[PDB]
Coordinates of C-alpha atoms in Angstrom, one line a residue:
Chain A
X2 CA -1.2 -6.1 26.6
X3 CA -1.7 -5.7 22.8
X4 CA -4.3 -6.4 20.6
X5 CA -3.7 -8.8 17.6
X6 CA -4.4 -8.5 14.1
X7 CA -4.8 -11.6 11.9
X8 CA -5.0 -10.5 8.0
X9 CA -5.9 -13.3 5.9
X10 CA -3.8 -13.1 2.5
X11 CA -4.7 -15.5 -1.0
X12 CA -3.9 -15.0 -4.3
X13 CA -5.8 -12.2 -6.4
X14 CA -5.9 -9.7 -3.2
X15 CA -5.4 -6.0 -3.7
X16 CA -1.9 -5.5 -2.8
X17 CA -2.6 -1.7 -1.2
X18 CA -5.8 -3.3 0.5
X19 CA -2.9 -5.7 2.3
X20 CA -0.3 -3.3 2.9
X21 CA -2.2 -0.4 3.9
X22 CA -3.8 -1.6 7.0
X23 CA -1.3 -4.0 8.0
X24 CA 1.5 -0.8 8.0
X25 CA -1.2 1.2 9.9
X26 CA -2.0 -1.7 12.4
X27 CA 1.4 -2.3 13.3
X28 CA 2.2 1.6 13.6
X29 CA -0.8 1.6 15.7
X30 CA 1.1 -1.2 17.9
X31 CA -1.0 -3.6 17.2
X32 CA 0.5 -7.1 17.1
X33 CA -0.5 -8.1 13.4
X34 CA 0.3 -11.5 11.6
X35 CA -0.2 -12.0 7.5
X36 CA -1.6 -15.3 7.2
X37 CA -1.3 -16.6 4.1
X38 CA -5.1 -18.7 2.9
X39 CA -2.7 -21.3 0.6
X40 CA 0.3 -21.8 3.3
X41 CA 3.3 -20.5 4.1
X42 CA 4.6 -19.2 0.5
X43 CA 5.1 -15.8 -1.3
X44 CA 1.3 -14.3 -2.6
X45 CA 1.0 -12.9 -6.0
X46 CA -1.5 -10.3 -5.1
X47 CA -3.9 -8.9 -7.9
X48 CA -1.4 -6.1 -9.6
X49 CA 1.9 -8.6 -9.2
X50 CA 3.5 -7.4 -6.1
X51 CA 5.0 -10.4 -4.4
X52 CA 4.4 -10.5 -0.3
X53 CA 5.5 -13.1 1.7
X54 CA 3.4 -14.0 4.5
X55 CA 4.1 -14.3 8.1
X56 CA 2.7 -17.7 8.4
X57 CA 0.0 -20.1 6.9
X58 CA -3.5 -19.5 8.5
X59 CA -2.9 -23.2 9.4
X60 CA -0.4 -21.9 11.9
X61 CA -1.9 -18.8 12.6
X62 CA -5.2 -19.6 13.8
X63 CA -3.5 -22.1 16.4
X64 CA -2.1 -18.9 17.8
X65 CA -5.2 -17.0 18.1
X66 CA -8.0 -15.6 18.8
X67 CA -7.8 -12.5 17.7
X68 CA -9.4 -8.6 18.3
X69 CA -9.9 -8.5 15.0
X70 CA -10.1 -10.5 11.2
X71 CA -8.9 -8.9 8.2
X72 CA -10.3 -9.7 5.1
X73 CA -8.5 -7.6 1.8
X74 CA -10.2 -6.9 -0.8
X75 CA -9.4 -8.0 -4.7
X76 CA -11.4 -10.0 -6.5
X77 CA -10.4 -12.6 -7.4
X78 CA -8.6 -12.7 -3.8
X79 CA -12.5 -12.7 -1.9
X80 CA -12.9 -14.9 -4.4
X81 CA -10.3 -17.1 -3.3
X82 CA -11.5 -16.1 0.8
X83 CA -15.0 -17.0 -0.1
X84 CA -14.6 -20.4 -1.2
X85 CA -12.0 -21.5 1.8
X86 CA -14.1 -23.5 4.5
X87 CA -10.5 -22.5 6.8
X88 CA -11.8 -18.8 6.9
X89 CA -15.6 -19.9 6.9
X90 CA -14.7 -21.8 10.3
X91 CA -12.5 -18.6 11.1
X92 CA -15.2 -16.0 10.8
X93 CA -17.7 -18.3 12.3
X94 CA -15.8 -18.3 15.2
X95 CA -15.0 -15.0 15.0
X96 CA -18.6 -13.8 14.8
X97 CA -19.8 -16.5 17.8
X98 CA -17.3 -14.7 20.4
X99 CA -18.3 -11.6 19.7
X100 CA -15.0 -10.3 17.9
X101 CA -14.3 -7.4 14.9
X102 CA -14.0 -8.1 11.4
X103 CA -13.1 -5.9 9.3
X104 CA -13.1 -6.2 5.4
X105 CA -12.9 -4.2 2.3
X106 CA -13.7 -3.4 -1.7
X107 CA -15.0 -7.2 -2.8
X108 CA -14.1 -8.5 1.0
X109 CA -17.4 -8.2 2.3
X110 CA -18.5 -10.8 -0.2
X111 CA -17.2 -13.3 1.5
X112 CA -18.8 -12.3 4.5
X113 CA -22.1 -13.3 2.3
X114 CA -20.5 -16.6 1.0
X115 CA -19.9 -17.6 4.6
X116 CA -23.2 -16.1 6.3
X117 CA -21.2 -13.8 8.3
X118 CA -23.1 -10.6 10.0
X119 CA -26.4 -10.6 8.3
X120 CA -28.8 -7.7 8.9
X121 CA -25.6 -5.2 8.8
X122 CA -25.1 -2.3 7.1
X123 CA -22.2 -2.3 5.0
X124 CA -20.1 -0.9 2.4
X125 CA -18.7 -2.5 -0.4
X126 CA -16.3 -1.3 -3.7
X127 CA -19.3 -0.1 -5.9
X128 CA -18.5 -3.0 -8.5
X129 CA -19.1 -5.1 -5.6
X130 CA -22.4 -4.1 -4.8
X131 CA -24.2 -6.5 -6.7
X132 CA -22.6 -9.5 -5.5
X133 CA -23.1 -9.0 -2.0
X134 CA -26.8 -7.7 -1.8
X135 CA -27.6 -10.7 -3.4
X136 CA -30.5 -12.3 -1.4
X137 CA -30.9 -8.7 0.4
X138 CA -28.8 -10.0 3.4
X139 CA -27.7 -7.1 4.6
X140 CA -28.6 -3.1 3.7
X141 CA -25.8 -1.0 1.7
X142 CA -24.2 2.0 2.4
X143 CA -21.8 4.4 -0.2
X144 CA -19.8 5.7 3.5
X145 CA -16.7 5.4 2.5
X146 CA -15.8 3.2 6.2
X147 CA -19.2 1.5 7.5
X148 CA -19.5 0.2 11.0
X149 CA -22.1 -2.0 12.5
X150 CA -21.4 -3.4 15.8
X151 CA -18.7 -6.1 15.0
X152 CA -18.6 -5.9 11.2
X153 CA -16.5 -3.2 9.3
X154 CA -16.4 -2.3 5.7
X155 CA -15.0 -0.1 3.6
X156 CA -15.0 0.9 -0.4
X157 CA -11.6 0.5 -2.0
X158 CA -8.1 0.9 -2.3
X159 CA -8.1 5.3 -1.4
X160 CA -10.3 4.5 1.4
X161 CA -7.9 2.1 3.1
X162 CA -6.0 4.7 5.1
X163 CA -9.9 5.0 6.7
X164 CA -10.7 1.8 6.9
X165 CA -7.2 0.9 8.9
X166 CA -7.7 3.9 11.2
X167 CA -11.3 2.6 12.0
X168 CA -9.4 -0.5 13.2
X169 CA -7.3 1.3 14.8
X170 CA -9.7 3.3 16.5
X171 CA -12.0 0.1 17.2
X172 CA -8.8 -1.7 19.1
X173 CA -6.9 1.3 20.4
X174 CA -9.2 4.4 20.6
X175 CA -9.6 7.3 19.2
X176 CA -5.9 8.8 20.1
X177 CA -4.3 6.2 19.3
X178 CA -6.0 6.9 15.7
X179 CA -4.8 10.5 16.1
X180 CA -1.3 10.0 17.1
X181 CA -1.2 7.5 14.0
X182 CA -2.8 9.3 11.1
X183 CA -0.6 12.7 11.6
X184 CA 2.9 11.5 10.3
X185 CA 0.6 9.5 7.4
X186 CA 0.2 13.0 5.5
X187 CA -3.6 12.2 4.9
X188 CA -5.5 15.2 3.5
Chain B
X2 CA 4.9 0.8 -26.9
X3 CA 4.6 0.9 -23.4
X4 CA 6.0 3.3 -20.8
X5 CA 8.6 1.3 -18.3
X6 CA 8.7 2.4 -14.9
X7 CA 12.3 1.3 -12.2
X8 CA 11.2 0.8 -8.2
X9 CA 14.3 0.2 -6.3
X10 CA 13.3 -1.2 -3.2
X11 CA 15.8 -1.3 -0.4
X12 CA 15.6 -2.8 3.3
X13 CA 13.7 -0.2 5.4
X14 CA 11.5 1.4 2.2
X15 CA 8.1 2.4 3.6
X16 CA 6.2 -0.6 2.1
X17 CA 2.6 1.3 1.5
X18 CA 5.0 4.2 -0.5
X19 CA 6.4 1.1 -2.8
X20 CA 2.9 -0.6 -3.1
X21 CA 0.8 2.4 -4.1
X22 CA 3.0 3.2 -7.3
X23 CA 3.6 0.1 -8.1
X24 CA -0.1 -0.8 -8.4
X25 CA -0.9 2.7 -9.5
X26 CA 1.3 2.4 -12.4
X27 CA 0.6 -1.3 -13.4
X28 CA -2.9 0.2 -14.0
X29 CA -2.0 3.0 -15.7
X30 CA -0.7 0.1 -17.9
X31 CA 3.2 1.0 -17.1
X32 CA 5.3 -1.6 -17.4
X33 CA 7.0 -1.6 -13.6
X34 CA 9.8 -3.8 -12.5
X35 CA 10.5 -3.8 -8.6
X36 CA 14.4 -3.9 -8.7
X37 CA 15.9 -5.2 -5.3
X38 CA 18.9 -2.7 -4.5
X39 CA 20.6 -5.6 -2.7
X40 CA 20.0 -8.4 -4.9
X41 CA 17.2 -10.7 -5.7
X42 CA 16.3 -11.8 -2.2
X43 CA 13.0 -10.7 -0.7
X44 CA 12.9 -7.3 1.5
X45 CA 11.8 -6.5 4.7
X46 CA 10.5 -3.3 4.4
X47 CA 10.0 -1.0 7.4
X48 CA 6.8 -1.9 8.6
X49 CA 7.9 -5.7 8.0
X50 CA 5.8 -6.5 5.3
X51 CA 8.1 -8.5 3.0
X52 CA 8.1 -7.7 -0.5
X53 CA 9.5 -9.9 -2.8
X54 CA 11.6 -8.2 -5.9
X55 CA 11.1 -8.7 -9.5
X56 CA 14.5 -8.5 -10.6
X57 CA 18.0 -7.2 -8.6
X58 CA 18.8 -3.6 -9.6
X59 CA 21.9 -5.4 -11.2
X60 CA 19.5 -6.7 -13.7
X61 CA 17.2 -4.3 -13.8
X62 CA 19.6 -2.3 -14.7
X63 CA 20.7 -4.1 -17.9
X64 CA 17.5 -3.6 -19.3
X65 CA 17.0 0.1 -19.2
X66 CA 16.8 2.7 -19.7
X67 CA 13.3 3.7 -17.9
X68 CA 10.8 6.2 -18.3
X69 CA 10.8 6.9 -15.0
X70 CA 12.8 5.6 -11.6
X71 CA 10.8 5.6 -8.5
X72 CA 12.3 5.8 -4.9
X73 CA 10.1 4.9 -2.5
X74 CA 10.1 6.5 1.6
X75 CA 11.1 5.2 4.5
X76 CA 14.1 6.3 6.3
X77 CA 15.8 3.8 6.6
X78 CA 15.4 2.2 3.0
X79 CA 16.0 6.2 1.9
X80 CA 19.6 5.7 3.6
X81 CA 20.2 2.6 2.3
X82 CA 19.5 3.9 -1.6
X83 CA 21.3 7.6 -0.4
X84 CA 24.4 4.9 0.1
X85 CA 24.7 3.1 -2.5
X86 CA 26.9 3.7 -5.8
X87 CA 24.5 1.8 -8.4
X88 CA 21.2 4.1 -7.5
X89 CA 23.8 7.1 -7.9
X90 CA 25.0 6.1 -11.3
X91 CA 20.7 5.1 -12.2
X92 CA 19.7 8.7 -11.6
X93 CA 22.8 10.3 -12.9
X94 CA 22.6 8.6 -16.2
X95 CA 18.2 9.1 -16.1
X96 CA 19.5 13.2 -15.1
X97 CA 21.1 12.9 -17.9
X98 CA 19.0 11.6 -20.6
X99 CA 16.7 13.6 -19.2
X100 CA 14.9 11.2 -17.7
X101 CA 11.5 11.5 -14.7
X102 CA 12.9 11.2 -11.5
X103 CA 10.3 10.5 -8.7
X104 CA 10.2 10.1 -5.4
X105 CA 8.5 10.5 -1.9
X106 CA 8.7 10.9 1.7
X107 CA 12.4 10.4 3.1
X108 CA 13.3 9.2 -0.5
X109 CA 14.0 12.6 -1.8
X110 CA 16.7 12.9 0.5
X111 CA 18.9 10.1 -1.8
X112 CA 18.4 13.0 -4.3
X113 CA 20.9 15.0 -2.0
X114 CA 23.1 12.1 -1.4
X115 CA 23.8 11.8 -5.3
X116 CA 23.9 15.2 -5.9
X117 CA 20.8 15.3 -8.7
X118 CA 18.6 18.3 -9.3
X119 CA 19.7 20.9 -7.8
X120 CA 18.0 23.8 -7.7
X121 CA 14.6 22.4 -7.8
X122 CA 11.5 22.8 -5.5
X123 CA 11.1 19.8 -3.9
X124 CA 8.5 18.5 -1.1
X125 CA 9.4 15.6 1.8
X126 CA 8.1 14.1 4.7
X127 CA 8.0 17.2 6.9
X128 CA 10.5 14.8 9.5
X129 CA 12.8 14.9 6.1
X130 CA 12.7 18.4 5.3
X131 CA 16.0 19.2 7.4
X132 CA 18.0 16.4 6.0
X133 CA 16.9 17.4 2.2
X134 CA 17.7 21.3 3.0
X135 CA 21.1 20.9 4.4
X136 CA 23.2 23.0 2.1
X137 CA 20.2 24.9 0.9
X138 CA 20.2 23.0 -2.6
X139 CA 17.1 22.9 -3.1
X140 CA 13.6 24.9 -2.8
X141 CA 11.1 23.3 -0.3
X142 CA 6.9 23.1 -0.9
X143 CA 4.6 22.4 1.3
X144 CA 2.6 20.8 -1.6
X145 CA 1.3 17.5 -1.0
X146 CA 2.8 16.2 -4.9
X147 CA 5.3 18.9 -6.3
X148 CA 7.1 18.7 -9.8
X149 CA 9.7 21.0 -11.0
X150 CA 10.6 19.7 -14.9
X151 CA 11.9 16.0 -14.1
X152 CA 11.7 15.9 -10.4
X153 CA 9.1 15.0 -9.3
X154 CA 8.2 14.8 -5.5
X155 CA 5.9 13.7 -2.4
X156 CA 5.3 14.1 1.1
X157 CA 4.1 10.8 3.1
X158 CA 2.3 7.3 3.2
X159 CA -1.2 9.8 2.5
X160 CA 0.4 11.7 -0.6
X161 CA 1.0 8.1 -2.4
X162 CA -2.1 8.0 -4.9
X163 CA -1.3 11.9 -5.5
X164 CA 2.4 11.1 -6.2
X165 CA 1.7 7.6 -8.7
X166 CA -1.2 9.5 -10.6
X167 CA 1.4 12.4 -11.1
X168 CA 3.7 10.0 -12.4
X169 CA 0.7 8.4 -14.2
X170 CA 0.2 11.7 -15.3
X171 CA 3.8 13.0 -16.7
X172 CA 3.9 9.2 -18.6
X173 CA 1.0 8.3 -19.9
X174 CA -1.3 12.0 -19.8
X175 CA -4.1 13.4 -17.6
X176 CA -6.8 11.3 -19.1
X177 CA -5.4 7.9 -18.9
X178 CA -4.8 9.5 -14.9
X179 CA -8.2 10.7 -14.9
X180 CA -9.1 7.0 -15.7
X181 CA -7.4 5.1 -13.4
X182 CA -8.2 7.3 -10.5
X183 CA -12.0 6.7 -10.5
X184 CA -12.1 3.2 -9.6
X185 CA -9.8 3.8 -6.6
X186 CA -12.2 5.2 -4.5
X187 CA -10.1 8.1 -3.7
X188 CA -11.3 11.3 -2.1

C-alpha cells in the first residue's frame, strides 16, 4: 500500500516550496493531498500563483494519519502555519506517533511556535535563522536538506528538488529517489 | 516601465515548469500574467496541482504585446498549446516583432507545431528531443538552458531556475539576475 503525504497550504506560502515537493511526491507514488489551513478555497501563495487545494485540513486530517507532514515554507505562509492551533494539534500528533515532518525555508519556525522536535538539528532559509534559534531550541545547520530522526528541513526554494527527494527517500527508499530524480534534469 | 511576461498554461503543463518562472520573474519584478489557453477556469496541471489562471489567453491577449511568452512543459499541456490556433498566432505575431520566445521541457515542441524559429539550436526534455527533431528543423543542445537570438530553451523540471533567470536575464540584465538568484538557495 502507499504512503500518504498531507501538505498543509495558507496564504503567504512559497508557491515552488508547494509545488515542488507535492509534483515529486506524487511522481514518487506517493498518495499526497493539499490541505488548505483556511478551508476548501483557492490559496494566493506568496508570489500570486493561485492553487486550489485538495481539501480543507478540516477534512483532511479526518482522513489521516499520515507518513509524513508537509509544512512549505514562505513567510508570511509559516506565519500563517505558526499561529493555527489545527496544525499545532496536527504536529503534536504527528510528533507523539512517531511520524516524519518535513518542512522548509521559514517552515521550521513553526515547528518552534508549536514546540515540535526540540533538541534537532535543523536547517532553515538563512533569513530564517534568527527566528527559529530563538530560545536555542534546537542546533542549526547550513546542509542544504537536514535530517534528524523524524524532523526534516531544508533551505529554500533551489533546494526543494532535495528536500522532496529526502521525502521521497524517507517513505520510498533510496531507488525510488533514483528512479524519480533522473527524468527531473537535476544537475 | 516594467517588463511584461505571457504564461499560457494549458491542461497537462508540468506545474513545477509554470511555477518556477512565474515566481522567478515576479521577483525579477516582471510583470507576469498566467493566461489560461482554454479560458478562465482553473487547470489541472499534470501532476494535479490546480493552478488557477490570471486572465484567459483571450484576454490576455488583448493586452499585449509581451516582452516575452513562456510555454511551460509537460506533454500533455505541450500538445494541447502545439494544437491550438491562438498560441500559433501569439508566437507568430511575438516572431515577428521580434519578440523572446521561451520555453522548456516538451514545450519546445509547440515551437514545431507552429512552425517558429527554424533553424535554431534548441534543447528539450531528452524524452522530447525526437518529436522536436522530426524534420530536422532545428539544431539540438545538450545544454541545460540554450538561447539562440529569441529562442530561448530548457531541458526539465531541474533546468527551471536556469531557464527563468535566463529569461530574467535577456529582460531585465545579468545583475538584476545575479540578484534575484542569491536568495533562492540555489546551487
Amino acid at each position: 500500500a502507499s504512503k500518504r503525504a498531507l501538505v498543509i497550504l495558507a496564504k503567504g506560502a512559497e508557491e515552488m516550496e508547494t509545488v515542488i515537493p507535492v509534483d515529486v511526491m506524487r511522481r514518487a507514488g506517493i498518495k499526497v493531498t493539499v490541505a488548505g489551513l483556511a478551508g476548501k478555497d483557492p490559496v494566493q501563495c506568496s508570489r500570486d500563483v493561485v492553487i486550489c487545494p485538495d481539501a480543507s485540513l478540516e477534512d483532511a486530517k479526518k482522513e489521516g494519519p499520515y507518513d509524513v507532514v508537509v509544512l512549505p515554507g514562505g513567510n508570511l505562509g509559516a506565519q500563517n502555519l505558526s499561529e493555527s492551533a489545527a496544525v499545532k494539534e496536527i504536529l503534536k500528533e504527528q510528533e507523539n506517533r512517531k511520524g516524519l515532518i518535513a518542512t522548509i525555508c521559514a517552515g521550521p519556525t513553526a515547528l518552534l511556535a508549536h514546540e515540535i522536535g526540540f533538541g534537532s538539528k535543523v536547517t532553515t532559509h538563512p533569513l530564517a535563522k534568527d527566528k527559529m534559534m530563538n530560545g536555542g531550541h534546537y542546533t542549526y545547520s547550513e546542509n542544504r536538506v537536514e535530517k534528524d530522526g523524524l524532523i526534516l528541513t531544508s533551505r529554500g526554494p533551489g533546494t526543494s528538488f532535495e528536500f522532496a527527494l529526502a521525502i521521497v527517500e524517507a517513505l520510498n527508499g533510496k531507488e525510488v529517489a533514483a528512479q524519480v530524480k533522473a527524468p527531473l534534469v537535476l544537475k
